[PDB]
Design an enzyme around this catalytic site. Structure first.
Site, mmCIF file in Angstrom:
data_model
loop_
_atom_site.group_PDB
_atom_site.id
_atom_site.type_symbol
_atom_site.label_atom_id
_atom_site.label_comp_id
_atom_site.label_asym_id
_atom_site.label_seq_id
_atom_site.Cartn_x
_atom_site.Cartn_y
_atom_site.Cartn_z
ATOM 1 N N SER A 1 0.795 -1.223 0.000
ATOM 2 C CA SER A 1 0.000 0.000 0.000
ATOM 3 C C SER A 1 0.833 1.283 0.000
ATOM 4 C CB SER A 1 -0.964 0.008 1.187
ATOM 5 O OG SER A 1 -1.919 -1.044 1.069
ATOM 6 N N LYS B 1 0.213 3.442 -3.001
ATOM 7 C CA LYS B 1 -0.908 4.368 -3.144
ATOM 8 C C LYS B 1 -0.400 5.810 -3.324
ATOM 9 C CE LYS B 1 -4.604 1.612 -1.102
ATOM 10 N NZ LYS B 1 -3.801 0.400 -0.827
HETATM 11 C C1 LIG Z 1 -6.120 -7.365 11.318
HETATM 12 S S1 LIG Z 1 -7.012 -8.393 10.216
HETATM 13 O O1 LIG Z 1 -8.299 -7.808 9.994
HETATM 14 O O2 LIG Z 1 -6.938 -9.739 10.693
HETATM 15 N N1 LIG Z 1 -6.230 -8.349 8.789
HETATM 16 C C2 LIG Z 1 -5.689 -7.255 8.048
HETATM 17 C C3 LIG Z 1 -5.719 -5.960 8.552
HETATM 18 C C4 LIG Z 1 -5.253 -4.904 7.789
HETATM 19 C C5 LIG Z 1 -4.748 -5.108 6.507
HETATM 20 C C6 LIG Z 1 -4.200 -3.985 5.708
HETATM 21 C C7 LIG Z 1 -4.476 -3.874 4.344
HETATM 22 C C8 LIG Z 1 -3.878 -2.890 3.580
HETATM 23 C C9 LIG Z 1 -2.996 -1.998 4.159
HETATM 24 C C10 LIG Z 1 -2.713 -2.076 5.517
HETATM 25 C C11 LIG Z 1 -1.722 -1.157 6.138
HETATM 26 O O3 LIG Z 1 -1.499 -1.166 7.341
HETATM 27 O O4 LIG Z 1 -1.140 -0.342 5.307
HETATM 28 C C12 LIG Z 1 -3.327 -3.062 6.285
HETATM 29 C C13 LIG Z 1 -4.733 -6.412 6.014
HETATM 30 C C14 LIG Z 1 -5.190 -7.472 6.773
#
Ligand SMILES: CS(=O)(=O)Nc1ccc(-c2cccc(C(=O)O)c2)cc1
Length: 242
Positions: free
Chosen positions: A47, A50
């Protein structure tokens, strides 16, 4: 020009993690890192992509401005904040992948590839699916390369309009108080090993700017908060923030 400070490793090991922080003092044109090798190892941008994606979408008119609403497609996803309408500001804030996947489709492979070369961005390689290459395609970027790209953005030197760069830097706003401003973007790479977290951006002070780029091993999502926490511990140790 570049100095290695392994004392920062304590901030990673105390949290049973491993990673790199890279700092750049804009006034002095000097860089600092705990791990010169890893500072130059290339990872999926995830990300953090972005930032360039936003710039390209704005400059091509795919995104009109930071107020344009990208309606939720009605497909329930496992991140609750994604199941709603977004603009550029909130899409950045909540790392709303599906909004940026549509940006990439509208940009298209040819223009995306052409623009990343103009940005000198990473290995400039968009091989893979146009709507996911920054997550599981061939593109790679190092922490030092993130700094170089961010410095161009800060100075409005990228080959897009000044307006596009101002809008993205507005959308990068993360924290501001009486002592500093942080403009940055998080990243979380899981589809290709090793799984890592990113945080890249800069700290604006009254009389200087400190660019930063960190990545760290991220075997589970439980450690995501360590991206900002570890960076700030390094910033505090170097007396960049109180
Ligand atoms: C906590 S959970 O709900 O088990 N899974 C989960 C949580 C967040 C993300 C995520 C996606 C894109 C970007 C980002 C970032 O921090 O930049 C975070 C992916 C999986």
């Amino acid at each position: 020009e570049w100095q290695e400070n392994k004392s920062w490793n304590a901030h990673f090991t105390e949290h049973k993690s491993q990673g790199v922080v890279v700092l750049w003092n804009e006034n002095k044109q000097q860089g600092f890192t705990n791990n010169l090798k890893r500072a130059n190892q290339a990872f999926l941008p995830a990300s953090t992509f972005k930032i360039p994606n936003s710039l390209i979408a704005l400059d091509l008119g795919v995104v009109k401005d930071e107020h344009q609403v990208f309606k939720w497609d009605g497909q329930t996803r496992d991140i609750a904040t994604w199941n709603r309408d977004h603009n550029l500001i909130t899409a950045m804030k909540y790392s709303v992948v599906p909004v940026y996947q549509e940006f990439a489709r509208q940009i298209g492979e040819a223009r995306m590839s052409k623009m990343l070369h103009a940005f000198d961005y990473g290995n400039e390689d968009i091989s893979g699916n146009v709507d996911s290459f920054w997550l599981d395609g061939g593109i790679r970027i190092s922490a030092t390369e993130q700094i170089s790209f961010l410095r161009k953005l800060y100075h409005n030197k990228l080959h897009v309009s000044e307006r596009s760069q101002r809008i993205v830097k507005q959308a990068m706003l993360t924290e501001a108080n009486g002592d500093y401003i942080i403009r940055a973007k998080t990243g979380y790479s899981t589809r290709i090993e090793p799984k890592i977290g990113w945080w890249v951006g800069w700290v604006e002070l009254d009389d200087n700017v400190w660019f930063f780029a960190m990545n760290m091993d991220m075997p589970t999502s439980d450690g995501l908060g360590l991206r900002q926490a570890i960076t700030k511990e390094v910033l505090k140790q170097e007396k960049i923030i109180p």
